[PDB]
Design a binder for this molecule. Structure first.
Ligand SMILES: [Mg+2]
Ligand SMILES: [Zn+2]
Ligand SMILES: [Zn+2]
Ligand SMILES: [Zn+2]
Lengths: 56, 46, 115, 258, 52, 48, 67, 427, 47, 528
């Protein structure tokens, strides 16, 4: 690119379309699930839904 | 007064002018290489 | 850049003395001989020859710095006997044994090449 | 109060090396004769390289470097040449230099090896040392060339390592360390020297306190620029010359003090 | 100055033989720019000799 | 002990705990240039 | 790139050995036999050929820019 | 985007990599039997990281399919070779399991910084900051994995006879004493190329750059430098010495108020970068994307190793050059061998690079035996006792120590200095 | 049959076959290859 | 904005008013030099031919300064600016006519700096007041700042590509101020912990520990070589400790020639037995491990880092307090020079012979690893069968982990002690550890015997996979090798699972080192 040799560094990310259960121990939620849902060959980006149990 | 440039891929040599677009005559190759200077060089063999 | 040129090891300049005698004042009969543009390949032989006199009480040499080309040979001799005399006898004794060594090396070559 | 009488015993003499034993001298005399083998022996080596043309894949300073380190036959000329910076000539002459000329263009599809043979002297005695093959200076593709003129001058090993006549100067005293200068932790593991004279039962010699270093064993292997015995003769002459000039300056300084 | 820019060959002294180009000229000691190594040296103008 | 005593004495030479932040150093009367030399620079000068 | 003219430690002229070293390798010797067939006793002279990579033969493939 | 790696496949307690696969796989370019034929044969397969949670992975087959007091005996896959867990820069380290792990990380940093022949077509490339080396060497102590990174074809660094000795005191605190005569024989003498690009800009007639030799009487703002080095087109011909604040590109831009007197177009020239010097290697003249004339000048400067120059081992053992002694000052063995480098003995015991010592020992064994020695990490066919028994046959001490003589006094050194060849990298 | 103790030279044969088949940069080349071969058409049709 | 121009660390207050770019300063790499005093820095010529001191023309120096102006610029010791009485600058680099190169009393001459000029030398990050000290210029040829070895310790500068900053004080008044406050002899003893900061660095310290042993004897020629390097020697060769059969000096006599004035200290060597001062021989030490310097002469004892180092009450601290501070500068320089020049005769190395124990020791190490490994396995089979009982205060799992960590730490300690009983007194690891110059007993234990338990966050290697640490181990494997204990040493090398667990522990150390820096610097900034 303009005579300059460019390298696309591979960028990590959380794996999409996969349910995860994490613990926001500082928030009001005991256990929070998530699923960074992203359909393959879809122009729209990912859209994370969270499913979280309240801590009381 | 013309400067002699070596025609990149062609490896032949040609004259050039001031305000002249840089083109070979053999195949119009755009990269010229300027010839080695005519003044003397001297190296200490160290 | 700041590379000293290669002739700084052995070439002197205008206003450089090859040898400088400075009479020591701490003890009697002692001198510092500052040799400019030399190294261990002179002062080591002079030190070892000055240790062979029975009249030299101290014979040492040091380089102040290995990037600056000078040595100092300190000589302390016995009183009645000048250290300059011990130094100029050490040089003559070295020239004596090296010329003798060179002649014996010549004779050994003539022995070896001629069977 | 005087100098002991040394003596020489030569064990072998080959066109590469000389192996000898110097007895009845001090350690510092012996080390200095080694250091004058390495440094203070003057030979003839290329020092002024004028590249007329170059098209080779190696750049100019690399070729001038490789022309520096080529040994030249200087067996009798180096005693006749003045040092270049000492001559009164118009900055180069045949009294302080040897002219070399290289003029090679590769006009063939084979890779043409510009070797040391292509260095052409005007002095028939000072030629590169290369039975053995020639010293490869630069390879050439078809179309490439190099032309240069190179002046060689007298110098010694302190100035640059291209004026070093010796390949290797092995030097050892007391090969069974009766002196115990080196102290082995377990002397059974240690291999015996070439000059050891102990039986294989014994590891190292018994200590003597009254001993001193003598019987110095040398192995002077030349690189080809000098015969290995004229390295030793030139070294002894150079060390005696350094000591004599030191004595002359000493006499001047003593006469200046008085 | 007239000397600056010329290519000179050091004709005397420890640097004898080196080719260079004068950066600065003085009434006394010119500064020669050595073609062989990377450095600039001051030399008396009696030593220098112009080449071509 | 000189250094520990000096630090513990500057933090308590005001009667209350002088926390070493902007929140404790920039509440004592020392000087607007001194107080703007620390982390909050423009706000100290605007207030002064 | 090209073979050094002198061994770095000794100063033994090793630059004339390289093509004969290649000849003794292709004539089915071991490398250790080829080195002391060329007569290199000291290991510092043996590393100079034993671990050389003759890179100039790669550089000669390219057509010369000047001609 | 998942990240997998190939593993062998283990039926009941046996590898599926039979001898016939090695027989068909040695004879490549003839049978056209590739890796992909072995993936097709159901012998290896790619396992990713999720599936590694549900796999029972044999490390090596010579230990882990033979009956013993059995560990699991339910292996599914077998690792091909453990040395393939390492990266590309941690693969060039000899014996990296003998080092400490911060030292391996630091070498992985330094191995990206070593000078060397970075590419084969470097004479065509107009790279900015090209560091190439005169006489690079392959390591005497190498791994098997350097054959596949092609490190023996474009290497970076020279095999050097180091000695590990306290000495005059210039290898004190991570520095090294070098040999002046070795350096004068081309040892790590490198060459640094730097290019310089400049084009002119045809604009709306108010400012118009053009390459020409600027004249003091014609051009304004012309800085006091030498302009007779330039050719007639405002460029340097190759093979011309330039130094700091020498011009390399004569370019003048026009001034819109030359009529709005007698003083015309201003100097806009690129000088050589100050406190640098060297010969102009080569100059190319061409057109850019925009059709404007455009010149690149690559300027060559060789770099002889001097003090302050930063060298490093293959183990994170960096250090600048403290001093350079000549050959007669450097110590020497019973034979004529002097060191090229002398490194600090105190650099070892807190850093704990024992792999440096083992590389040095295997280097003596390799340079004497006449073979490029093997230093794969997880081997078990090479430990230090076998290296010592191989060294003892060539007339040396078992553990590489060798009696150095002093270079100044000639009295042989009371301790026995560890000496031998390692592989040093110039950074 | 199997490889009893010449395994040490038999594994580097298959490492060499891997790096002669694949090479060191199959990630970059295969990723861009599948991009410009399939995914650009997928972007054009999915608009 | 304007508030954004002022508010930053790169702003006007902090970025330009507090810390600003300064003229008359140089930055190059440092490389060691032991042949110059502790307050001398060896600057290059091309730095010194570019940094100028404005010297006032007085009738004492008018001929000297006249000659330096006649040399002009780039005839190195000369000058570049000559400043008139009305503040008019005249160049000397552009070669003016000779009529205005005259000097009368009152002109300034900005001359190139020579030997003996004072400079300020520092290292970022400047932590304390001995990280920025005043040196005297020595002009040495090559292009680095050669500075001395014992000034490494206050600077924390380890020459592996470290470059330092050199400021020149321009006025004569600030030159005298730096000479009277910030000289490195006046910054030997620190106020933070009333002890010295210089000490004696590594190679001089091992060579002086080997030097001052009881069995070191010196021939007359070696004595005369060593006494050549004492700056403070009054020219009197001492009487030998051995007159007959051969005149033979002990190294403690030469070291008594080093020790200045008449100072009196009693210290203990690092391997002094604690049961020696109980019974007999408390004044005639059989190991020569009780340092007594007395009336300025080293009576007895071997000088480790507890004698010459930066510990308080050491020999150098008492040399600072009883004698002067110029005298301690001389003491440091004399130790460095004469002990390096003895070390040329002695020689000191380290090798692979120094990392190998005899086979009886290896059998002891392997028997201890096998015994402790079987003990961990039998603790595990007690833990599975609920026969392990919980320690009061924690769970059964934390009780188990205490048992396993206690057995493995006992194994590491017992193998470490059984390794270090087998150095045979010539092992150079022991030579550097006993002097305290570089390393510790743990490094000897890890090189010879066993690396030991690898840790991540203070506990063992966690189960990153499902209930196993690596996919080579069976699930729920709480054994030694599964959980990160490394039984191999650096001489034998690590197996790949042990290599990876070792790399984990090392990554934890590098994360600590890289994250520590910013928070510690911000704490320092808030405190100041
Ligand atoms: Mg550092
Ligand atoms: Zn053409
Ligand atoms: Zn002449
Ligand atoms: Zn050699």
């Amino acid at each position: 690119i303009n005579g300059s040799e460019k390298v696309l560094i591979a960028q990590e990310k959380m794996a999409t379309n996969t349910v995860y259960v994490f613990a926001k121990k500082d928030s009001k939620y005991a256990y929070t699930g998530e699923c960074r849902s992203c359909l393959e060959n879809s122009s729209r980006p990912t859209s994370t839904i969270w499913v979280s149990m309240l801590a009381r | 007064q013309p400067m002699i440039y070596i025609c990149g891929e062609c490896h032949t040599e040609n004259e050039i002018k001031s305000r002249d677009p840089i083109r070979c005559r053999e195949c119009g190759y755009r990269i010229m290489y300027k010839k080695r200077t005519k003044r003397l060089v001297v190296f200490d063999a160290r | 850049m700041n590379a000293p040129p290669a002739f700084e090891s052995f070439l002197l300049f205008e206003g450089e003395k090859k040898i400088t005698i400075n009479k020591d004042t701490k003890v009697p009969n002692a001198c510092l001989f500052t040799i400019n543009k030399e190294d261990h390949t002179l002062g080591n032989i002079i030190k070892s020859q000055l240790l062979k006199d029975p009249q030299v009480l101290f014979a040492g040499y040091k380089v102040p710095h290995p990037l600056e080309h000078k040595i100092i040979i300190r000589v302390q001799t016995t009183p009645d006997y000048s250290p300059q005399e011990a130094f100029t006898n050490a040089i003559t004794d070295l020239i004596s044994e090296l010329s003798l060594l060179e002649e014996r090396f010549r004779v050994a070559i003539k022995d070896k090449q001629e069977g | 109060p005087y100098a002991n009488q040394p003596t020489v015993r030569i064990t072998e003499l080959t066109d590469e090396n000389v192996k000898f034993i110097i007895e009845n001298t001090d350690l510092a005399v012996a080390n200095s004769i080694r250091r004058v083998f390495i440094a203070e022996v003057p030979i003839i080596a290329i020092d002024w390289v004028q590249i007329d043309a170059n098209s080779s894949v190696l750049h100019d300073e690399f070729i001038a470097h490789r022309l520096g380190l080529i040994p030249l036959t200087s067996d009798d000329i180096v005693d006749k040449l003045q040092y270049s910076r000492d001559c009164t000539c118009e900055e180069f002459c045949p009294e302080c230099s040897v002219e070399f000329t290289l003029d090679v263009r590769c006009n063939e599809d084979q890779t043409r090896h510009v070797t040391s043979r292509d260095l052409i002297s005007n002095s028939p005695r000072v030629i590169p040392v290369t039975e053995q093959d020639d010293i490869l200076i630069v390879k050439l593709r078809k179309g490439q060339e190099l032309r240069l003129r190179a002046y060689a001058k007298k110098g010694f090993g302190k100035e640059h390592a291209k004026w070093n006549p010796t390949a290797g100067v092995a030097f050892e005293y007391d090969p069974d360390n009766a002196l115990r200068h080196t102290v082995y932790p377990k002397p059974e593991e240690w291999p015996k020297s070439e000059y050891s004279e102990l039986d294989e039962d014994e590891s190292q010699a018994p200590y003597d306190p009254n001993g001193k270093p003598e019987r110095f064993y040398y192995n002077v292997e030349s690189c080809g620029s000098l015969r290995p015995e004229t390295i030793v003769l030139s070294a002894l002459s150079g060390l005696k010359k350094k000591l004599s000039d030191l004595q002359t300056q000493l006499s001047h300084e003593i006469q200046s003090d008085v | 100055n007239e000397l600056i820019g010329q290519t000179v060959r050091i004709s005397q002294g420890p640097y004898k033989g080196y080719i260079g180009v004068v950066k600065d000229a003085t009434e006394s000691t010119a500064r020669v720019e050595l073609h062989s190594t990377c450095q600039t040296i001051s030399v008396d103008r009696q030593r220098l000799t112009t080449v071509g | 002990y000189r250094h520990l005593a000096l630090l513990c004495d500057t933090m308590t030479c005001r009667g209350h705990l002088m926390a070493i932040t902007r929140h404790g150093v920039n509440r004592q009367d020392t000087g607007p240039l001194m107080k703007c030399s620390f982390e909050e620079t423009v706000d100290v000068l605007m207030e002064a | 790139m090209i073979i050094p003219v002198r061994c770095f430690t000794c100063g033994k002229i090793v630059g004339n050995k390289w093509e004969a070293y290649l000849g003794l390798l292709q004539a089915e010797y071991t490398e250790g036999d080829a080195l002391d067939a060329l007569g290199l006793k000291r290991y510092c002279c043996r590393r100079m050929l034993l671990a050389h990579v003759d890179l100039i033969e790669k550089l000669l493939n390219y057509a010369p820019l000047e001609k | 985007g998942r990240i997998c790696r190939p593993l062998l496949i283990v039926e009941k307690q046996k590898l599926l990599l039979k001898k016939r696969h090695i027989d068909q796989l040695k004879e490549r370019e003839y049978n056209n039997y590739s890796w992909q034929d072995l993936v097709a044969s159901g012998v290896v397969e790619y396992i990713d990281t999720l599936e590694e949670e549900t796999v029972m992975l044999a490390m090596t087959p010579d230990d882990l399919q033979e009956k013993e007091v059995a560990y699991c005996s339910t292996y599914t896959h077998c690792e091909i070779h453990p040395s393939m867990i390492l990266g590309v820069c941690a693969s060039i380290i000899p014996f990296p399991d003998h080092n400490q792990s911060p030292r391996n990380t630091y070498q992985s940093a330094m191995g990206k910084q070593a000078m060397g022949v970075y590419i084969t077509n470097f004479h065509v490339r107009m790279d900015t900051l090209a560091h190439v080396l005169y006489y690079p060497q392959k390591p005497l102590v190498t791994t098997r994995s350097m054959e596949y990174l092609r490190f023996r074809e474009l290497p970076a660094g020279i095999n050097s006879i180091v000695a590990i000795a306290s000495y005059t005191g210039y290898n004190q605190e991570d520095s090294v004493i070098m040999n002046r005569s070795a350096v004068d024989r081309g040892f790590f003498r490198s060459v640094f190329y730097r290019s310089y690009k400049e084009q002119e800009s045809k604009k709306g007639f108010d400012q118009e750059e053009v390459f020409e030799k600027p004249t003091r009487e014609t051009c304004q703002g012309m800085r006091h430098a030498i302009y007779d080095k330039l050719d007639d087109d405002g460029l340097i011909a190759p093979g011309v010495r330039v130094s700091g604040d020498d011009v390399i590109i004569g370019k003048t831009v026009t001034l819109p108020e030359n009529e709005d007197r007698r003083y015309t177009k201003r100097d806009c020239s690129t000088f050589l970068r100050t406190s640098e010097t060297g010969i102009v290697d080569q100059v190319m003249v061409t057109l850019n994307q925009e059709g404007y004339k455009f010149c690149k000048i690559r300027v060559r400067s060789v770099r002889i190793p001097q003090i302050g120059d930063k060298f490093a081992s293959r183990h994170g053992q960096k250090g600048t050059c403290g001093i350079q002694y000549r050959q007669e000052d450097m110590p020497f063995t019973c034979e004529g061998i002097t060191p090229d480098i002398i490194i600090n003995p105190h650099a070892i015991p807190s850093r704990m690079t024992i792999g440096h010592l083992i590389e040095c020992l295997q280097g003596k064994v390799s340079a004497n035996k006449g073979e490029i020695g093997d230093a794969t990490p997880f081997n078990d066919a090479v430990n230090v006792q076998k290296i010592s028994n191989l060294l003892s046959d060539y007339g040396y001490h078992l553990r590489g120590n060798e009696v150095l003589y002093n270079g100044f006094t000639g009295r042989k050194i009371t301790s026995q200095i560890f000496i031998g060849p390692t592989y040093y990298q110039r950074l | 049959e199997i490889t009893p103790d010449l395994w040490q030279e038999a594994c580097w044969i298959v490492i060499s076959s891997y790096f002669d088949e694949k090479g060191l940069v199959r990630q970059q080349l295969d990723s861009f290859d599948e991009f410009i071969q399939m995914s650009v058409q997928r972007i054009v049709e999915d608009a | 904005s304007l508030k954004q121009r002022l508010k930053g660390k790169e702003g006007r207050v902090r970025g330009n008013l507090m810390g600003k770019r300064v003229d008359f300063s140089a930055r190059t790499v440092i490389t060691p030099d032991p042949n110059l005093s502790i307050d001398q820095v060896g600057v290059p010529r091309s730095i010194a031919a570019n940094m100028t001191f404005a010297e006032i023309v007085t009738p004492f120096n008018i001929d000297r300064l006249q000659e330096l102006v006649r040399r002009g610029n780039s005839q190195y010791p000369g000058a570049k600016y000559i400043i008139r009485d009305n503040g008019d600058r005249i160049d000397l680099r552009f070669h003016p006519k000779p009529s205005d190169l005259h000097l009368q009393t009152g002109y300034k001459v900005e001359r190139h700096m020579c030997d003996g000029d004072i400079v300020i030398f520092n290292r970022q990050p400047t932590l304390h007041k001995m990280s920025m000290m005043g040196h005297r210029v020595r002009i040495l040829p090559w292009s680095t700042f050669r500075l001395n070895l014992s000034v490494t310790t206050p600077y924390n500068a380890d020459f592996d590509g470290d470059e330092m900053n050199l400021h020149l004080p321009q006025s004569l008044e600030t030159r005298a101020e730096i000479q009277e406050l910030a000289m490195v002899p006046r910054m030997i003893v620190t106020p933070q912990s009333n002890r010295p900061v210089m000490g004696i660095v590594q190679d001089t310290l091992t060579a002086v520990r080997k030097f001052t042993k009881r069995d070191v004897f010196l021939e007359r020629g070696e004595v005369m070589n060593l006494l050549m390097f004492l700056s403070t020697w009054d020219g009197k060769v001492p009487q030998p400790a051995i007159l007959k059969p051969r005149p033979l000096w002990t190294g403690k006599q030469i070291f008594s020639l080093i020790i200045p004035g008449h100072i009196n200290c009693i210290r203990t060597h690092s391997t002094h037995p604690d049961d020696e001062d109980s019974g007999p021989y408390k004044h005639i030490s059989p190991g020569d491990t009780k340092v007594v310097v007395e009336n300025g002469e080293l009576i007895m004892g071997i000088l480790c880092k507890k004698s010459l180092g930066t510990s308080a009450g050491s020999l150098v601290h008492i040399s600072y307090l009883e004698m002067g501070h110029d005298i301690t500068r001389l003491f440091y320089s004399n130790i460095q020079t004469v002990i390096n020049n003895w070390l040329l005769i002695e020689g000191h190395t380290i090798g692979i012979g120094d990392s190998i124990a005899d086979s009886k020791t290896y059998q002891d190490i392997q028997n201890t690893i096998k015994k402790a490994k079987q003990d961990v396995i039998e603790v595990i089979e007690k833990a599975h069968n609920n026969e392990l009982e919980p320690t009061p205060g924690n769970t059964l799992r934390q009780t188990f982990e205490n048992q396993v960590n206690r057995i493995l730490n006992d194994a590491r300690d017992k193998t470490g002690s059984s390794a270090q009983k087998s150095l045979s007194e010539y092992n150079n690891f022991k030579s550097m550890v006993v002097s305290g110059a570089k390393g510790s007993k743990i490094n000897i234990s890890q090189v010879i015997a066993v690396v030991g338990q690898q840790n991540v966050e203070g506990k063992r290697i966690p189960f990153g996979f499902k209930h196993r640490t690596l996919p080579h181990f069976i699930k729920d494997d709480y054994g030694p090798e599964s959980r990160g204990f490394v039984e191999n040493s650096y001489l034998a090398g690590l197996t790949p699972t042990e290599f990876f667990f070792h790399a984990m522990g090392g990554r934890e150390g590098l994360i600590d080192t890289a994250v520590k820096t910013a928070e510690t610097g911000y704490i320092q900034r808030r405190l100041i």
